[PDB]
Amino acid sequence: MVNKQKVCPACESAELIYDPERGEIVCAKCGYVIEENIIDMGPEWRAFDA
């Protein structure tokens, strides 16, 4: 994260789009993802025991 953080830093295409299946947000132009891990709590997904 650096500066505003939005749009496409790649192609200059401000149209992005969301991806609820992965938790992603991609470009609507070049195809480029932005982030794809929109979470940080970790209920029951990492580490296992008992």
What residues form the annotated binding site for Zn(2+)?
Answer: 8, 11, 27, 30
**∠ at Cα 12 (30, 39), nearest 5°?**
70
Q: Which of 14, 17, 18, 30 binds Zn ion (CB under 5 A)?
A: 30
Is-contact 13 29, C-beta < 8 A?
yes
Report the distance separating Cα 7 and Cα 16, nearest Å: 6
Number of residues that bind Zn ion (CB under 5 A): 8
Q: Which of 6, 9, 11, 17 binds Zn ion (CB under 5 A)?
A: 11
Residues that bind Zn ion (CB under 5 A): 8, 10-11, 13, 27, 29-30, 32
